[PDB]
Write a protein that binds this ligand. Structure first.
Ligand SMILES: CCCCCCCCCO[C@@H]1O[C@H](CO)[C@@H](O)[C@H](O)[C@H]1O
Ligand SMILES: Cc1ncc(C[n+]2cccc(CCO)c2C)c(N)n1
Length: 178
């Protein structure tokens, strides 16, 4: 967990997440597949909770200071661009330090982290985005559909990519000095 290498990986994955976040990802309206979560999920899985949290923090800051965040208020910004991307760090609780690498924990951490992130967007949807609720939908129903569907699709893409990495590059997930 040597500091320079550790800090470098953190910076690298936050930057990567930011850069991937520049790829168009809209399916319909605010229904998206947030492939940009993946670098942070990988960072968390490999390096653990704290690193993941910090990587998420950095990515969220980047989103906002480069003008790519959609901000409606300070509270909403804090929730959706600090709390939400930080919360991806929870994948770090499912880190595996010892080989052989198992698939299940990678999927569990991913599922839990994407769920938690989209849980905060869901809340945010109720509070701040209800004006956009499709005709005839109430605020909770709209937010669940929107953020529920985005969360699932996002978990799908994370699953696909991370499953390829587990089969191809299992070592991405296991940190070692040496
Ligand atoms: C106005 C506040 C901005 C300054 C406070 C710290 C900025 C957060 C990012 O820090 C570093 O910045 C590099 C370029 O910004 C990133 O590429 C790198 O990943 C990151 O580690
Ligand atoms: C109903 C609804 N619409 C929009 C948003 C905003 N939102 C949703 C998902 C992810 C993100 C972060 C950038 O990908 C944002 C800002 C919402 N929460 N709910």
């Amino acid at each position: 967990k040597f500091n320079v290498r550790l800090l470098t990986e953190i910076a690298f994955m936050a930057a990567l997440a930011f850069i991937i976040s520049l790829i168009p990802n809209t399916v319909y309206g605010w229904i998206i597949v947030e492939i940009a979560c993946i670098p942070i999920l990988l960072l968390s899985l490999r390096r653990g909770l704290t690193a993941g949290l910090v990587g998420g923090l950095i990515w969220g800051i980047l989103s906002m200071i480069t003008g790519h965040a959609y901000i409606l208020s300070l509270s909403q910004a804090f929730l959706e661009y600090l709390v939400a991307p930080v919360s991806l760090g929870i994948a770090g609780l499912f880190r595996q330090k010892t080989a052989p690498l198992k698939l299940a924990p990678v999927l569990l951490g991913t599922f839990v982290a994407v769920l938690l992130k989209y849980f905060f967007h869901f809340i945010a949807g109720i509070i701040f985005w209800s004006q956009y609720a499709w005709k005839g939908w109430g605020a909770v129903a709209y937010s669940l559909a929107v953020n529920g569907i985005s969360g699932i699709l996002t978990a799908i893409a994370a699953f696909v990519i991370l499953i390829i990495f587990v089969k191809k590059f299992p070592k991405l997930f296991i940190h070692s000095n040496y």
